[PDB]
Every structure is written in C-alpha cells, then in structure tokens.
C-alpha cells in the first residue's frame, strides 16, 4: 500500500516514520470522525434517523431528557437541535449524550443504519436554534479519506499496530473502522470509543466489548443482538480520556509513534501527551479557529515542556493536511 | 505542623521530600477514602441513609436501576447489596453508580448527612449477597487520619499545593476535605472527584464545580442548594481517570511530588504514571492482599519502565504505613 492521497511532504514524513518504526512492536492512534474520514458519524446518523422517523423524542431513553425541550407552536424541537443546546451547556454534557442517544437499538440494527448512512451520499437536513430563531443545516454523511485508508493499511503492513480512539460510541465507530468493506481494516478489538452498557434482552446480562476484550472473551458477532443502553463505561474517550484510554487499553509506558486528530480540545491530550518523543502529530486542519487553537497549544506546551525539564516535543513532527488533501 | 502521627522513619522521608520541594510550585495528590481518612465515605453513607430510611429503592433515580433487584420472600434487597452485585459485573459499573446513588439530594442536605455520618462513629449494619447467601457486615464510617491531617497542612505550609483525587463523588469528598472542621483544610477547588451534573431547580441551570472552576467562577457556597443528578461528567476519577484528572485539572507536564493511595487498581495509574521521578509513593496499606498486589505492580512497572527507555522510578521512594500508624 502506498501513500497516494497525500501531499508529498506529508507522504515523505509518514514514510520516514513508518520505515523507522517497522516491526518493532510500535503502534498508532487515530481519531475517527473528521480525522480518518471526513464529517461525523453520530452528527449525521442522528438527524438521519430522525428524518427516517426511527429516532424520536418518544423512544429517547428518559435518562437523556436532561433539559426541557424547546418547542414552538410551529415546531417540535428536534433531537439534533436538543444536542446543540446540550453542547452550549458544555462539551462534557453533549459528548456522552450524542453517543447515548442511540440507546434502545441493538448493534445489528444500528449496523444496518450506519451502512445505510454510509451509502446515502446526500446532505441530511437538520434544524437547530441560532439563539432564538429556527435555523437549518445540511449534515454530510461521513466520507472515507482515501489517504487515511491507505495510511492505516501501510502501518499494518509494516507491523505497526493501528488503534482508533474516538469520542464517538465505540460500537458505531467499529461498524465502519473494522468492516473491511470500508477499507480501513482495523482490528475490531483495536477500535476504542465511548462505551455504554450493552444489554442482553433475554438474560438481562450487561456487558461491553471493552470488558470482553480485557477478559479475552471478545466475540463481535455475539454482541449484535445486544441493546445499547445509555449507562456510561469509562474511560470516556474524549479530551484527557483519550490519553486514559491509551494507558488503560493499549500500554502504560510505550507511547504511540503516531497520533491523529482534528479537534483541538478533544484530541489534544493524546496528541500532546501521548505521541512519543519521536512520533508524528498528524493533524487534519479543517477549520481556522481550530488551526489557531492548536498552534497556541503547540507554543504553550513547548514552553511548558522546557520549563518542566522535558525534551521539547510538542512542536516536533507535525504533519498537517486539510480534508481535501487526503480525500 | 509537625508530623507527629507517623512512624519516625516515614516522618523523616516525608520531611526530606517537603524540604527539597518547599515553595517551588510543586504539588501533591491524595486519594481520599482509606488514604486520607480511614474507611469509606460512600460505602458507609449509603447504608447509613438506608438505615435511616432516607435512601430507599423507590427514591433511587430510575436511570440507576440497571438490573433487577434480587428479593427473597423474607428479605428485600438493600441498595448496599445491589451496589455489590453491580461491582460483580464490573468496577466500571459500580464506581459511577455508588456516587450517582446520592442523586436527588441537594449538596446542603448531603452535607448535613455527611457531618452526621462523620459524627456517628459506630459501624452501620448492612447486608449483601454472598453469591446466593445473604451475608452481613458492619460498615465503618470514615475516621480522620491524624497523620494525613498533619501531612496535608505541613505540605500546604511549605507551599506544596495539595489536591485530592478521589473516586468518590467530588462534592461528598469536598464536604470532608475542605471543611475546616475535619482539619485537612484542602482548598475546595482542589478537591477532584467523581462529578455529576448539578441542577439548580430555581433557574434550571445544569452545572458542576469542575465547570465553574475551569471558568474561573467558583463559589462552593453558591452550590449548596443545587440538586445532585446522576448524569456523569468526566474525566471519571478512578483508575486511569485519576491520571486524566491530573492532566485536565492540575498540570499537563509537571508531575506531583507525592501521590497517596490505598487501592491498587483505582490508585495505580496516578501512583505509577503520575508520581514525579523524585516524588514519593505514599501507600496506606490496609489489606495484605492489596499490599501484595501493589508490590507485584511495582515489579511489573519497574521492569516495563526499563523496557521502554525510561528511568526506573516505579520502585522508588515508597512510604508505606498502616491505618493504625497514622490514625
Ligand atoms: Cl473526538
Ligand atoms: Cl479510589
Ligand atoms: Mg474527530
Ligand atoms: Mg481510596
């Protein structure tokens, strides 16, 4: 596999790193949404299922009705719009919530919807509230980044283990990252994301893939008819939780030789704290506000590293691309 | 403050650490339950509130009823017993649950009960299932460790900032650690624990101390009449969430010069990954089995730090005391 869909300087660096680190027990970590593919799985699957009338205020787990709905005589507030209002309280509210909102469905069912969504290829209209007025928006379904697909594979081929650490529900992400049809070929056990309790509707048994994996009894097929529940397992794989996830599920001491992200706060803990001294920070720049945020973080963290007596690595080996460069 | 309630050799090592690090912007992190005071706040407050008839099944937030209660015609299953069955599923189930179970009380009501619990002094009878057998125990309310009270204050007097990172509800822990009455004198903003959304029923606002503290706008008095809800905020402050909490709320690069705990799995990440190269691992050895597990882990991490190119510090500067020695 070769790095076709990459700017050549980006390709040279990745090639250097891959070559330097081949077959030595090394590993890499990718965020998923807007990093491994363009756009956002949950943020499109949610308004997609609403549109299909599958996911409605009526079926939403009561534990997720955290605030009153904002209904106009004209209009019932959508789940999508409710989500946006949850994020205005805080990221730490709406991040779990937008994974939990898929509770009530079995994995088989969600898998049908993900693939439906993945093949949809049209924008999905969603309504929200710009302050007080009903605004509207089209949300793109996810689009595989050819470059990431290639890099995932070339890493694997050179004996570099590939992990996904995602702020999205681990089961949803796995439905794309680990299904060969999408071409990433991640190992399903190597997909790490937001985990909620899965419930056996016959026995009442509660389980999660992370527990099965830690116990060495993971069977993905056996989980298909389990129902997603909202109850949150941890580490919650966002912000410092991404670094917690690496320590918990990957390695306590060995650092990834490559970390990929796109959201400065969500991905910055694993980018800055996780990435090995000589590893690459892979960055999908999709937004100026974000590019600026991460540049200030590079400056603050480089100075803090020096002040703390650590080698300055926060500013080393950035490989920065835009979505269009790797599509 | 003198370290009077310490064995003399542990007093000297702690004194040496303090003198080397005094007034230099250094910090220390303590677990609370079984490390800062003897016994366990939530595990005693729960059956205390049950015995009082204040906290019952019908009061339990609905989202917390994860599995059927196991009643025999003679006996109704206690919430304490229910908690222990949740732990048998996984720690990652019963840790959040045993903080969340205090949902539906305001901070002020909970403070009244905590002070009550802290003044009661006697063990609290409770029942749980020993597989299928109804089994019995007496749960001890927390007992302030005089030595830890001294060490918190001696750190602070020497310009070593003290933090609590506890897997108990942040607000419950703050009710002990930051109330001058118990003598630890932790700053309330330095108490880091399990956080859940707090509801102001007057204004509708959902907030947390963590949120207020990061916005630079925290007043503990302001929150007293907010209701605890179960919605989990993160980082969740156990296991790797403790290390995630250090990074999120304390410092991204500077490491604590002392980390204290007592539970090998839940404290192990901050103990091993958090503790500064030169810092002290303060261990409160309450159970031979845990003492054996921590020694095992030191071996394992010493060797893994070595196999990862790092200076071996896992086995360095252990100050190990029993509850009886610092009581
Ligand atoms: Cl993310
Ligand atoms: Cl703990
Ligand atoms: Mg992303
Ligand atoms: Mg403890």
From Swiss-Prot, chains A, B:
Q: Which UniProt keywords apply?
A: Disulfide bond, Hydrolase, Magnesium, Metal-binding, Periplasm, Signal, Virulence
Q: Which cofactor does it need?
A: Mg(2+)
PANTHER family, A to Z: PHOSPHATASE RV3661-RELATED, PHOSPHOSERINE PHOSPHATASE
Instruction: Describe the pH dependence.
Output: Optimum pH is dependent on the substrate: optimum pH is 5-8 with phosphorylcholine, 6 with phosphorylethanolamine and 5 with pNPP.
Q: Which family does it belong to?
A: Belongs to the HAD-like hydrolase superfamily.
Q: Where are the catalytic residues?
A: 31 (nucleophile), 33 (proton donor)
What species does this protein belong to? Pseudomonas aeruginosa (strain ATCC 15692 / DSM 22644 / CIP 104116 / JCM 14847 / LMG 12228 / 1C / PRS 101 / PAO1)
- UniProt effect for mutating residue 267 to E: Retains 3% of activity. Still activated by Mg(2+), Zn(2+) or Cu(2+). Slight decrease in inhibition by tetramethylammonium chloride
Q: What is this protein called?
A: Phosphorylcholine phosphatase
